[PDB]
Design an enzyme around this catalytic site. Structure first.
Site, mmCIF file in Angstrom:
data_model
loop_
_atom_site.group_PDB
_atom_site.id
_atom_site.type_symbol
_atom_site.label_atom_id
_atom_site.label_comp_id
_atom_site.label_asym_id
_atom_site.label_seq_id
_atom_site.Cartn_x
_atom_site.Cartn_y
_atom_site.Cartn_z
ATOM 1 N N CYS B 133 0.474 -0.917 -0.047
ATOM 2 C CA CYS B 133 0.091 0.034 0.111
ATOM 3 C C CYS B 133 0.616 1.581 -0.054
ATOM 4 O O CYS B 133 1.018 1.888 1.152
ATOM 5 C CB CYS B 133 -0.953 0.418 1.031
ATOM 6 S SG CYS B 133 -2.626 1.154 0.844
ATOM 7 N N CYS B 136 -1.043 4.648 2.031
ATOM 8 C CA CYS B 136 -0.303 4.035 3.438
ATOM 9 C C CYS B 136 1.159 4.243 3.654
ATOM 10 O O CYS B 136 1.230 4.623 5.177
ATOM 11 C CB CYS B 136 -0.850 2.411 3.493
ATOM 12 S SG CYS B 136 -2.710 1.670 2.388
ATOM 13 N N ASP B 137 2.108 3.940 3.245
ATOM 14 C CA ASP B 137 3.339 3.540 3.329
ATOM 15 C C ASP B 137 4.096 4.701 2.992
ATOM 16 O O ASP B 137 5.470 4.838 3.301
ATOM 17 C CB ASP B 137 3.906 2.118 3.436
ATOM 18 C CG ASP B 137 1.992 1.590 4.279
ATOM 19 O OD1 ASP B 137 2.164 0.094 3.627
ATOM 20 O OD2 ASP B 137 2.541 1.967 5.679
#
Ligand SMILES: Cc1cc2nc3c(=O)[nH]c(=O)nc-3n(C[C@H](O)[C@H](O)[C@H](O)COP(=O)(O)OP(=O)(O)OC[C@H]3O[C@@H](n4cnc5c(N)ncnc54)[C@H](O)[C@@H]3O)c2cc1C
Ligand SMILES: Cc1cc2nc3c(=O)[nH]c(=O)nc-3n(C[C@H](O)[C@H](O)[C@H](O)COP(=O)(O)OP(=O)(O)OC[C@H]3O[C@@H](n4cnc5c(N)ncnc54)[C@H](O)[C@@H]3O)c2cc1C
Lengths: 311, 311
Positions: B133, B136-137
């Protein structure tokens, strides 16, 4: 030029700002007309926002969103936006004081608000038994009697809903007729937990320092009065979408809206205008919850990021 | 029988359970195949959930959701559901060990799962530098270097996305050509922050206490072992939607799905089957964020409440 202009600083705009900035947009600016947090800020308690277990006032709830949503480079403009317009393939933001800002993409996160009634005691007892959200607050009145004020779909629908939770619901209206869908009205007329109080006016919301104890009401047919004893009073007297920023000089709308003035979007929060997005209570079918608005803000920001990558 | 059966206890089903139960549904049951929280539980760090200011593992992030979402009467069954089927005007929920439950309504909140590679180190490092992701990251490797594995459109889109955040992105693929749209391949090849490593195979993922630190990679033509130093490794090798529960004895699907298996919904989380709703990563156009799944759950529950009033 600004890469992305976010109009409105409630949950939708704050989440849009978090996501855009965390997603690598270098010049994202959030426009807010004074006091970040939006509508929830008028609530004396919120408990249904998933993943935040402490029950706390709307103002306290929203206050950690300030440092988190601004943590990744988001900028502020403290100013009422008057208008957003299309100019070539970008946008012009007109501030109410006459200054102008250009932006490549725009997110409309301007929300709306409940009509007020101005009945005596409404402001005094607000959050202590006067309410505008049956979803938010209906559960506090679980085995009790409750009153609903209103004439349209939301009022009648909310009376049906509260009738599922509460011991009894008085449905108060100034007219025997309801500006709502006729089948929903039939359901309510056939629900034995709903007593119709028509034609009535609420003259005062009365109670003590813990909140509402009763409503003074009058039958406008007979003018007979009555003191109605209830801890909870729900008003559903209309909703205003904060549309105004969409209106052009020639009085046309920036983008496609529904017949109540909400902005049309698809599942990615796109409007019919390229580079223009919307998120929150402002868009069609908005459930009118903080998680919902926050979700819209995230998804609108993700759409912006793809858009800037391709243009 | 059960009023509403919620299938899956990730953020989608949790919040559906919160809303349904707070909205007066007296018999709401959550079905979870062992250990709620869903996918984020595998991550060592979440920071982009709006309103949650502390950065914290997924396990810790999800802990308060259990308390909150179960606070209003929500019931559970810890069992893997094998099938949901329509019968008359209700639903039959078949558990994988043969037990049967009936429910008036059903919310599918079964999510999905990325495909794994099995590169030695993939479990050891899962959610600790190994990610599926970019959203997300990505921001963690802000001015850092990063590797992406995959050959489809998504590996290629996510490497462009990451190139706008990271100093450099190594794009690793088992051959010289790609399964993605030709135009998007063009864009990558002109992206100077994107370095193609083709025909390559990653031989090992290595790290330490703080997580990923390097990958052992190998040129498939040349047979030279490079060692690629990078602190972040993104893997985009396919995705599967947890569909299985929808397949009928006759091999057909309960409800309408798109080409990839995702369940078709409208803005109120309605499928084309009466009484059946869906929420989260399972549905069409899901952004694949916790806030989004949680929003779908709230709104699916809201639709369940109206449906149960009507029926
Ligand atoms: C009394 C009350 C209690 C509530 N309780 C709950 C609850 O318990 N749980 C729950 O989930 N939801 C609750 N809600 C609903 C929730 O507040 C809304 O759904 C949510 O705030 C919508 O978010 P938004 O970002 O779309 O809009 P808003 O919150 O309405 O914010 C839009 C922002 O934009 C700003 N703005 C508007 N026009 C302009 C402009 N011209 N220029 C610059 N800025 C502008 C406004 O000042 C406002 O700050 C409650 C709402 C109210 C009113
Ligand atoms: C590595 C990674 C990092 C991520 N990081 C973030 C992040 O930083 N921020 C963010 O917002 N999101 C992040 N996400 C995405 C987020 O986790 C998902 O979007 C979110 O969990 C989707 O929620 P869901 O409820 O739809 O499904 P899921 O989280 O997948 O939950 C589905 C649940 O249903 C259960 N289930 C499935 N089938 C059955 C069945 N047959 N019977 C019974 N139970 C069943 C599963 O066991 C699971 O508990 C991340 C995801 C991954 C993989």
């Amino acid at each position: 030029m600004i890469d992305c202009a976010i109009i409105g600083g409630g949950p939708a705009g704050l989440s849009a700002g978090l996501y855009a900035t965390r997603g690598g947009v270098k010049n994202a600016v959030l426009f807010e007309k004074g006091m970040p947090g939006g509508q929830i800020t008028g609530s004396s308690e919120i408990e249904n926002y998933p993943g935040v277990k402490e029950v706390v006032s709307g103002l306290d709830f929203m206050q950690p969103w300030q440092e988190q949503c601004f943590r990744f480079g988001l900028k502020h403009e403290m100013t009422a936006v008057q208008r957003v317009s299309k100019k070539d393939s970008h946008f012009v933001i007109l501030a109410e004081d006459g200054k102008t800002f250009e932006a490549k993409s725009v997110i409309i996160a301007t929300g709306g608000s409940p009509k007020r009634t101005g009945i005596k005691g409404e402001s005094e007892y607000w959050g202590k038994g006067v309410s505008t959200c049956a979803t938010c607050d209906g559960f506090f009145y679980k085995n009790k009697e409750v009153a609903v004020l209103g004439g349209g779909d939301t009022a009648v629908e909310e009376a049906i809903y509260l009738a599922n939770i509460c011991k009894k619901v008085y449905l108060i209206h100034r007219r025997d007729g309801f500006r709502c869908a006729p089948i929903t009205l039939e359901h309510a007329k056939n629900n034995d937990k709903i007593e119709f109080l028509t034609p009535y006016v609420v003259e005062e919301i009365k109670g003590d320092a813990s909140g509402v104890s009763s409503l003074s009401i009058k039958n406008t047919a007979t003018n007979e009065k009555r003191e109605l004893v209830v801890p909870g009073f729900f008003i559903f007297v209309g909703y205003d979408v904060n549309n105004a920023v969409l209106k052009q000089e020639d009085n046309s709308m920036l983008c496609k809206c529904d017949e109540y003035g909400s902005i049309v979007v698809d599942f990615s929060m796109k409007t019919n205008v390229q580079g223009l997005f919307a998120a929150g209570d402002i868009r069609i079918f908005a459930p009118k919850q903080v998680v919902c608005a926050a979700s819209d803000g995230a998804t609108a920001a993700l759409s912006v990021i793809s858009y800037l990558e391709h243009h």
